Amino acid sequence: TAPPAFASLFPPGLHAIYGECRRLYPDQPNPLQVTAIVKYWLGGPDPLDYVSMYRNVGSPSANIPEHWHYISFGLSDLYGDNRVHEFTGTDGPSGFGFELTFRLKRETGESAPPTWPAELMQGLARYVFQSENTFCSGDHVSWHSPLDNSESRIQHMLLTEDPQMQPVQTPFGVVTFLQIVGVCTEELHSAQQWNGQGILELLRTVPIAGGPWLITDMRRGETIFEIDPHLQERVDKGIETDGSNLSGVSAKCAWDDLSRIPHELIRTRQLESVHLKFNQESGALIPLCLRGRLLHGRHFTYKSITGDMAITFVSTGVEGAFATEEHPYAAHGPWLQILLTEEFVEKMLEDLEDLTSKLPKEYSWPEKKLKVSILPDVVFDS
């Protein structure tokens, strides 16, 4: 409602973001910042000009922890004179369309916010700029490193809309706010197997993880599923409902013929009977591959990590597949495409209590000439 001091100095882009900040925190008009002094468009390594570091009381009254809030400047068009972003105009997204935020739970000893998350936001922005790929709500980041650089359990990231921050209309476009959320490797794998938003919704329930504002505690030693097993059950139901985002996986697998691009020999062979082979972990993905993908009219690919051999499960819905309901087992080279009808896969699932919820475990369908075997990995090692 009241303007900032020395307003004519601030660029209109930067002005609108700081507008949203002042709204949230009228108490701190001078929050500690991390500033880039060697600018990115001059040769500097850091794409983010400023990182404001606020403090939020939270609502322990409503069971929301006290935490440090971080907000970036640079990902959106701040200056609007084509120095780093092409001037888009008011319509559409400003710059890359968003600025990062992050919420780190306050520990003791902290009279001030740590600065490592600002350095993380730098490295994270380095990807966006060097690849021009744009993140949105639900997207994940395989960081494969403890975020604070600590030996901490939290090694990956999920991206959500910031609960407090409202999208703003700069004279250069709209700017949404994507809040970074730290996650465990296993919780990242869940978000790969199912949508990102649904896993976010799960994290919101568990207050320690967690919480409705998705505050990151780096001290968290166990995953949401170790905190609560009943959540594991709520994932599959979603994979049944929404489907799976995971389109394939590199894993120890093989396929054998039971019949009695490119080479290019100008022909591809079809098979009457087929025998598929998997490990424990790879064979443990079948339910989601079937229930999650084929029942949703999508496909799934297994590739062997050791060498050249692939199996692509296709539903009758896909296009371009060389396997039809009439000749369902078709192979080009060592790439086998298997086509399974919606009626047959429902039957397959009822014959598959795979995760017991001993090897080798074989499954036969003489009615369809299919044999799937789950066996120890020392085989594919050969």
mmCIF file with all atom_site columns, C-alpha atoms in Angstrom, residues 151-297:
data_model
loop_
_atom_site.group_PDB
_atom_site.id
_atom_site.type_symbol
_atom_site.label_atom_id
_atom_site.label_alt_id
_atom_site.label_comp_id
_atom_site.label_asym_id
_atom_site.label_entity_id
_atom_site.label_seq_id
_atom_site.pdbx_PDB_ins_code
_atom_site.Cartn_x
_atom_site.Cartn_y
_atom_site.Cartn_z
_atom_site.occupancy
_atom_site.B_iso_or_equiv
_atom_site.pdbx_formal_charge
_atom_site.auth_seq_id
_atom_site.auth_comp_id
_atom_site.auth_asym_id
_atom_site.auth_atom_id
_atom_site.pdbx_PDB_model_num
ATOM 1   C CA . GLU A 1 151 ? 26.006 -36.186 5.139   1.00 0.00 ? 151 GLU A CA 1
ATOM 2   C CA . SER A 1 152 ? 22.255 -35.422 5.424   1.00 0.00 ? 152 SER A CA 1
ATOM 3   C CA . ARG A 1 153 ? 19.532 -37.843 4.282   1.00 0.00 ? 153 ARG A CA 1
ATOM 4   C CA . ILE A 1 154 ? 17.757 -35.206 2.169   1.00 0.00 ? 154 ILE A CA 1
ATOM 5   C CA . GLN A 1 155 ? 19.453 -35.464 -1.235  1.00 0.00 ? 155 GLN A CA 1
ATOM 6   C CA . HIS A 1 156 ? 16.828 -34.539 -3.832  1.00 0.00 ? 156 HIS A CA 1
ATOM 7   C CA . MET A 1 157 ? 14.236 -31.895 -4.641  1.00 0.00 ? 157 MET A CA 1
ATOM 8   C CA . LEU A 1 158 ? 10.578 -31.535 -5.554  1.00 0.00 ? 158 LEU A CA 1
ATOM 9   C CA . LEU A 1 159 ? 9.036  -28.333 -6.941  1.00 0.00 ? 159 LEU A CA 1
ATOM 10  C CA . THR A 1 160 ? 5.711  -26.910 -5.776  1.00 0.00 ? 160 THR A CA 1
ATOM 11  C CA . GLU A 1 161 ? 3.835  -23.609 -5.933  1.00 0.00 ? 161 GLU A CA 1
ATOM 12  C CA . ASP A 1 162 ? 4.745  -21.456 -2.925  1.00 0.00 ? 162 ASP A CA 1
ATOM 13  C CA . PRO A 1 163 ? 1.784  -21.505 -0.466  1.00 0.00 ? 163 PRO A CA 1
ATOM 14  C CA . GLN A 1 164 ? 2.164  -17.837 0.540   1.00 0.00 ? 164 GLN A CA 1
ATOM 15  C CA . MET A 1 165 ? 3.649  -16.124 -2.550  1.00 0.00 ? 165 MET A CA 1
ATOM 16  C CA . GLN A 1 166 ? 1.077  -14.916 -5.082  1.00 0.00 ? 166 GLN A CA 1
ATOM 17  C CA . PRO A 1 167 ? 1.787  -14.738 -8.845  1.00 0.00 ? 167 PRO A CA 1
ATOM 18  C CA . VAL A 1 168 ? 2.613  -11.160 -9.888  1.00 0.00 ? 168 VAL A CA 1
ATOM 19  C CA . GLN A 1 169 ? 2.104  -9.192  -13.104 1.00 0.00 ? 169 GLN A CA 1
ATOM 20  C CA . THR A 1 170 ? 5.364  -7.413  -13.933 1.00 0.00 ? 170 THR A CA 1
ATOM 21  C CA . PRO A 1 171 ? 5.520  -5.110  -16.990 1.00 0.00 ? 171 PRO A CA 1
ATOM 22  C CA . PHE A 1 172 ? 7.574  -7.943  -18.506 1.00 0.00 ? 172 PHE A CA 1
ATOM 23  C CA . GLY A 1 173 ? 5.113  -10.792 -17.837 1.00 0.00 ? 173 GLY A CA 1
ATOM 24  C CA . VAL A 1 174 ? 3.791  -13.002 -15.030 1.00 0.00 ? 174 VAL A CA 1
ATOM 25  C CA . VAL A 1 175 ? 5.996  -14.464 -12.315 1.00 0.00 ? 175 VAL A CA 1
ATOM 26  C CA . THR A 1 176 ? 4.897  -17.556 -10.408 1.00 0.00 ? 176 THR A CA 1
ATOM 27  C CA . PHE A 1 177 ? 6.825  -18.912 -7.414  1.00 0.00 ? 177 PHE A CA 1
ATOM 28  C CA . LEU A 1 178 ? 8.200  -22.452 -7.270  1.00 0.00 ? 178 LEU A CA 1
ATOM 29  C CA . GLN A 1 179 ? 9.125  -23.575 -3.771  1.00 0.00 ? 179 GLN A CA 1
ATOM 30  C CA . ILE A 1 180 ? 11.956 -26.109 -3.567  1.00 0.00 ? 180 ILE A CA 1
ATOM 31  C CA . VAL A 1 181 ? 11.251 -29.081 -1.298  1.00 0.00 ? 181 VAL A CA 1
ATOM 32  C CA . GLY A 1 182 ? 14.017 -31.435 -0.168  1.00 0.00 ? 182 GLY A CA 1
ATOM 33  C CA . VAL A 1 183 ? 13.294 -35.172 -0.378  1.00 0.00 ? 183 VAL A CA 1
ATOM 34  C CA . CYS A 1 184 ? 14.838 -38.612 0.180   1.00 0.00 ? 184 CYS A CA 1
ATOM 35  C CA . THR A 1 185 ? 16.056 -40.727 -2.749  1.00 0.00 ? 185 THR A CA 1
ATOM 36  C CA . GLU A 1 186 ? 13.203 -43.197 -2.146  1.00 0.00 ? 186 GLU A CA 1
ATOM 37  C CA . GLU A 1 187 ? 10.610 -40.403 -2.039  1.00 0.00 ? 187 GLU A CA 1
ATOM 38  C CA . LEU A 1 188 ? 12.011 -39.071 -5.313  1.00 0.00 ? 188 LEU A CA 1
ATOM 39  C CA . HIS A 1 189 ? 11.568 -42.548 -6.818  1.00 0.00 ? 189 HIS A CA 1
ATOM 40  C CA . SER A 1 190 ? 7.924  -42.451 -5.726  1.00 0.00 ? 190 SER A CA 1
ATOM 41  C CA . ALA A 1 191 ? 7.480  -39.117 -7.528  1.00 0.00 ? 191 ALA A CA 1
ATOM 42  C CA . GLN A 1 192 ? 9.056  -40.643 -10.632 1.00 0.00 ? 192 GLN A CA 1
ATOM 43  C CA . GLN A 1 193 ? 6.718  -43.672 -10.498 1.00 0.00 ? 193 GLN A CA 1
ATOM 44  C CA . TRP A 1 194 ? 3.642  -41.534 -9.764  1.00 0.00 ? 194 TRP A CA 1
ATOM 45  C CA . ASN A 1 195 ? 2.960  -37.829 -10.416 1.00 0.00 ? 195 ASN A CA 1
ATOM 46  C CA . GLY A 1 196 ? 4.932  -35.169 -8.496  1.00 0.00 ? 196 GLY A CA 1
ATOM 47  C CA . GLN A 1 197 ? 1.846  -33.326 -7.202  1.00 0.00 ? 197 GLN A CA 1
ATOM 48  C CA . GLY A 1 198 ? 0.405  -36.440 -5.523  1.00 0.00 ? 198 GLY A CA 1
ATOM 49  C CA . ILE A 1 199 ? 3.624  -37.079 -3.605  1.00 0.00 ? 199 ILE A CA 1
ATOM 50  C CA . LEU A 1 200 ? 3.633  -33.386 -2.613  1.00 0.00 ? 200 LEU A CA 1
ATOM 51  C CA . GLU A 1 201 ? 0.117  -33.902 -1.265  1.00 0.00 ? 201 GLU A CA 1
ATOM 52  C CA . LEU A 1 202 ? 1.466  -36.843 0.745   1.00 0.00 ? 202 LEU A CA 1
ATOM 53  C CA . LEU A 1 203 ? 4.318  -34.813 2.255   1.00 0.00 ? 203 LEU A CA 1
ATOM 54  C CA . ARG A 1 204 ? 1.766  -32.192 3.381   1.00 0.00 ? 204 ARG A CA 1
ATOM 55  C CA . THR A 1 205 ? 0.101  -34.675 5.743   1.00 0.00 ? 205 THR A CA 1
ATOM 56  C CA . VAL A 1 206 ? 3.256  -35.808 7.567   1.00 0.00 ? 206 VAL A CA 1
ATOM 57  C CA . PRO A 1 207 ? 4.064  -32.831 9.838   1.00 0.00 ? 207 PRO A CA 1
ATOM 58  C CA . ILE A 1 208 ? 7.737  -33.695 10.502  1.00 0.00 ? 208 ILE A CA 1
ATOM 59  C CA . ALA A 1 209 ? 8.768  -34.096 6.833   1.00 0.00 ? 209 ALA A CA 1
ATOM 60  C CA . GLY A 1 210 ? 6.880  -32.166 5.649   1.00 0.00 ? 210 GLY A CA 1
ATOM 61  C CA . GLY A 1 211 ? 3.837  -30.143 6.692   1.00 0.00 ? 211 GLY A CA 1
ATOM 62  C CA . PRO A 1 212 ? 1.238  -28.151 4.682   1.00 0.00 ? 212 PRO A CA 1
ATOM 63  C CA . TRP A 1 213 ? 3.829  -25.455 3.873   1.00 0.00 ? 213 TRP A CA 1
ATOM 64  C CA . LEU A 1 214 ? 6.458  -28.055 2.910   1.00 0.00 ? 214 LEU A CA 1
ATOM 65  C CA . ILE A 1 215 ? 9.304  -26.859 5.121   1.00 0.00 ? 215 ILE A CA 1
ATOM 66  C CA . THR A 1 216 ? 12.567 -28.767 4.748   1.00 0.00 ? 216 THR A CA 1
ATOM 67  C CA . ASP A 1 217 ? 14.190 -30.226 7.869   1.00 0.00 ? 217 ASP A CA 1
ATOM 68  C CA . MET A 1 218 ? 17.714 -31.396 7.003   1.00 0.00 ? 218 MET A CA 1
ATOM 69  C CA . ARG A 1 219 ? 17.901 -33.408 10.244  1.00 0.00 ? 219 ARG A CA 1
ATOM 70  C CA . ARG A 1 220 ? 15.116 -35.793 9.151   1.00 0.00 ? 220 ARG A CA 1
ATOM 71  C CA . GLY A 1 221 ? 16.608 -39.296 9.319   1.00 0.00 ? 221 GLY A CA 1
ATOM 72  C CA . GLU A 1 222 ? 13.778 -41.466 7.984   1.00 0.00 ? 222 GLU A CA 1
ATOM 73  C CA . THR A 1 223 ? 11.431 -41.270 4.983   1.00 0.00 ? 223 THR A CA 1
ATOM 74  C CA . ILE A 1 224 ? 7.670  -40.587 5.095   1.00 0.00 ? 224 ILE A CA 1
ATOM 75  C CA . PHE A 1 225 ? 7.086  -44.320 4.500   1.00 0.00 ? 225 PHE A CA 1
ATOM 76  C CA . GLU A 1 226 ? 9.330  -45.240 7.437   1.00 0.00 ? 226 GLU A CA 1
ATOM 77  C CA . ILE A 1 227 ? 7.378  -42.678 9.474   1.00 0.00 ? 227 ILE A CA 1
ATOM 78  C CA . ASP A 1 228 ? 4.109  -44.144 8.140   1.00 0.00 ? 228 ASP A CA 1
ATOM 79  C CA . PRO A 1 229 ? 3.656  -47.398 6.117   1.00 0.00 ? 229 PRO A CA 1
ATOM 80  C CA . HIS A 1 230 ? -0.020 -46.655 5.236   1.00 0.00 ? 230 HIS A CA 1
ATOM 81  C CA . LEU A 1 231 ? 1.264  -43.981 2.813   1.00 0.00 ? 231 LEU A CA 1
ATOM 82  C CA . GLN A 1 232 ? 2.877  -46.670 0.645   1.00 0.00 ? 232 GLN A CA 1
ATOM 83  C CA . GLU A 1 233 ? -0.696 -47.924 0.085   1.00 0.00 ? 233 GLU A CA 1
ATOM 84  C CA . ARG A 1 234 ? -1.994 -44.481 -0.947  1.00 0.00 ? 234 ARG A CA 1
ATOM 85  C CA . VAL A 1 235 ? 0.619  -44.292 -3.736  1.00 0.00 ? 235 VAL A CA 1
ATOM 86  C CA . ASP A 1 236 ? -0.442 -47.395 -5.664  1.00 0.00 ? 236 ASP A CA 1
ATOM 87  C CA . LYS A 1 237 ? -4.080 -46.386 -5.558  1.00 0.00 ? 237 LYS A CA 1
ATOM 88  C CA . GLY A 1 238 ? -2.954 -43.155 -7.251  1.00 0.00 ? 238 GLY A CA 1
ATOM 89  C CA . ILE A 1 239 ? -0.813 -45.034 -9.778  1.00 0.00 ? 239 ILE A CA 1
ATOM 90  C CA . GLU A 1 240 ? -4.021 -46.966 -10.469 1.00 0.00 ? 240 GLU A CA 1
ATOM 91  C CA . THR A 1 241 ? -6.030 -43.719 -10.636 1.00 0.00 ? 241 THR A CA 1
ATOM 92  C CA . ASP A 1 242 ? -3.721 -41.228 -12.383 1.00 0.00 ? 242 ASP A CA 1
ATOM 93  C CA . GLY A 1 243 ? -1.234 -43.689 -13.891 1.00 0.00 ? 243 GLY A CA 1
ATOM 94  C CA . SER A 1 244 ? 2.562  -43.703 -13.861 1.00 0.00 ? 244 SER A CA 1
ATOM 95  C CA . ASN A 1 245 ? 4.923  -41.004 -15.147 1.00 0.00 ? 245 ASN A CA 1
ATOM 96  C CA . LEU A 1 246 ? 7.793  -43.507 -15.418 1.00 0.00 ? 246 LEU A CA 1
ATOM 97  C CA . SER A 1 247 ? 8.047  -44.559 -19.082 1.00 0.00 ? 247 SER A CA 1
ATOM 98  C CA . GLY A 1 248 ? 10.935 -47.029 -18.751 1.00 0.00 ? 248 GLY A CA 1
ATOM 99  C CA . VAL A 1 249 ? 13.976 -48.173 -16.783 1.00 0.00 ? 249 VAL A CA 1
ATOM 100 C CA . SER A 1 250 ? 17.485 -49.516 -17.324 1.00 0.00 ? 250 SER A CA 1
ATOM 101 C CA . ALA A 1 251 ? 17.670 -52.769 -15.339 1.00 0.00 ? 251 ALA A CA 1
ATOM 102 C CA . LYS A 1 252 ? 18.907 -56.375 -15.513 1.00 0.00 ? 252 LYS A CA 1
ATOM 103 C CA . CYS A 1 253 ? 16.429 -58.100 -17.853 1.00 0.00 ? 253 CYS A CA 1
ATOM 104 C CA . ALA A 1 254 ? 16.359 -60.602 -20.714 1.00 0.00 ? 254 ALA A CA 1
ATOM 105 C CA . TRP A 1 255 ? 13.969 -62.213 -23.181 1.00 0.00 ? 255 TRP A CA 1
ATOM 106 C CA . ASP A 1 256 ? 14.213 -65.646 -24.795 1.00 0.00 ? 256 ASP A CA 1
ATOM 107 C CA . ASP A 1 257 ? 12.516 -66.928 -27.934 1.00 0.00 ? 257 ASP A CA 1
ATOM 108 C CA . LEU A 1 258 ? 10.405 -70.084 -27.616 1.00 0.00 ? 258 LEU A CA 1
ATOM 109 C CA . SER A 1 259 ? 9.607  -70.407 -31.347 1.00 0.00 ? 259 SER A CA 1
ATOM 110 C CA . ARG A 1 260 ? 10.537 -74.046 -32.131 1.00 0.00 ? 260 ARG A CA 1
ATOM 111 C CA . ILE A 1 261 ? 17.639 -48.892 -36.342 1.00 0.00 ? 261 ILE A CA 1
ATOM 112 C CA . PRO A 1 262 ? 19.329 -50.451 -38.134 1.00 0.00 ? 262 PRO A CA 1
ATOM 113 C CA . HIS A 1 263 ? 21.110 -53.433 -39.758 1.00 0.00 ? 263 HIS A CA 1
ATOM 114 C CA . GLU A 1 264 ? 19.749 -53.057 -42.391 1.00 0.00 ? 264 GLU A CA 1
ATOM 115 C CA . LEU A 1 265 ? 18.461 -56.458 -43.590 1.00 0.00 ? 265 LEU A CA 1
ATOM 116 C CA . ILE A 1 266 ? 15.024 -54.982 -44.515 1.00 0.00 ? 266 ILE A CA 1
ATOM 117 C CA . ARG A 1 267 ? 12.904 -57.344 -42.363 1.00 0.00 ? 267 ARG A CA 1
ATOM 118 C CA . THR A 1 268 ? 11.652 -57.898 -38.785 1.00 0.00 ? 268 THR A CA 1
ATOM 119 C CA . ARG A 1 269 ? 10.653 -61.147 -37.141 1.00 0.00 ? 269 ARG A CA 1
ATOM 120 C CA . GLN A 1 270 ? 7.597  -62.165 -35.152 1.00 0.00 ? 270 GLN A CA 1
ATOM 121 C CA . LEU A 1 271 ? 7.494  -64.765 -32.372 1.00 0.00 ? 271 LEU A CA 1
ATOM 122 C CA . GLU A 1 272 ? 4.865  -67.328 -31.393 1.00 0.00 ? 272 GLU A CA 1
ATOM 123 C CA . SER A 1 273 ? 6.011  -68.052 -27.833 1.00 0.00 ? 273 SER A CA 1
ATOM 124 C CA . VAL A 1 274 ? 8.183  -65.818 -25.635 1.00 0.00 ? 274 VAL A CA 1
ATOM 125 C CA . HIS A 1 275 ? 9.993  -66.106 -22.275 1.00 0.00 ? 275 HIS A CA 1
ATOM 126 C CA . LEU A 1 276 ? 10.753 -62.919 -20.318 1.00 0.00 ? 276 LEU A CA 1
ATOM 127 C CA . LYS A 1 277 ? 13.315 -62.799 -17.497 1.00 0.00 ? 277 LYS A CA 1
ATOM 128 C CA . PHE A 1 278 ? 13.824 -60.235 -14.719 1.00 0.00 ? 278 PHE A CA 1
ATOM 129 C CA . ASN A 1 279 ? 15.726 -59.629 -11.484 1.00 0.00 ? 279 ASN A CA 1
ATOM 130 C CA . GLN A 1 280 ? 14.032 -59.009 -8.104  1.00 0.00 ? 280 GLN A CA 1
ATOM 131 C CA . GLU A 1 281 ? 13.964 -55.173 -8.252  1.00 0.00 ? 281 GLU A CA 1
ATOM 132 C CA . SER A 1 282 ? 13.270 -54.927 -12.004 1.00 0.00 ? 282 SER A CA 1
ATOM 133 C CA . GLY A 1 283 ? 10.618 -57.653 -11.776 1.00 0.00 ? 283 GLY A CA 1
ATOM 134 C CA . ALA A 1 284 ? 9.174  -55.707 -8.838  1.00 0.00 ? 284 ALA A CA 1
ATOM 135 C CA . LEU A 1 285 ? 8.211  -52.934 -11.307 1.00 0.00 ? 285 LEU A CA 1
ATOM 136 C CA . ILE A 1 286 ? 5.878  -55.148 -13.379 1.00 0.00 ? 286 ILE A CA 1
ATOM 137 C CA . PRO A 1 287 ? 2.757  -54.287 -11.322 1.00 0.00 ? 287 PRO A CA 1
ATOM 138 C CA . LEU A 1 288 ? 3.246  -50.531 -11.868 1.00 0.00 ? 288 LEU A CA 1
ATOM 139 C CA . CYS A 1 289 ? 4.307  -51.158 -15.475 1.00 0.00 ? 289 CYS A CA 1
ATOM 140 C CA . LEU A 1 290 ? 1.073  -53.086 -16.066 1.00 0.00 ? 290 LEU A CA 1
ATOM 141 C CA . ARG A 1 291 ? -1.413 -51.430 -13.681 1.00 0.00 ? 291 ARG A CA 1
ATOM 142 C CA . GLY A 1 292 ? 0.100  -47.967 -14.091 1.00 0.00 ? 292 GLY A CA 1
ATOM 143 C CA . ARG A 1 293 ? 0.914  -47.800 -17.808 1.00 0.00 ? 293 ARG A CA 1
ATOM 144 C CA . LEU A 1 294 ? -0.737 -50.456 -20.005 1.00 0.00 ? 294 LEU A CA 1
ATOM 145 C CA . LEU A 1 295 ? -4.121 -50.105 -18.278 1.00 0.00 ? 295 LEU A CA 1
ATOM 146 C CA . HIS A 1 296 ? -3.809 -46.362 -18.969 1.00 0.00 ? 296 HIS A CA 1
ATOM 147 C CA . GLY A 1 297 ? -3.086 -46.883 -22.677 1.00 0.00 ? 297 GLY A CA 1
#
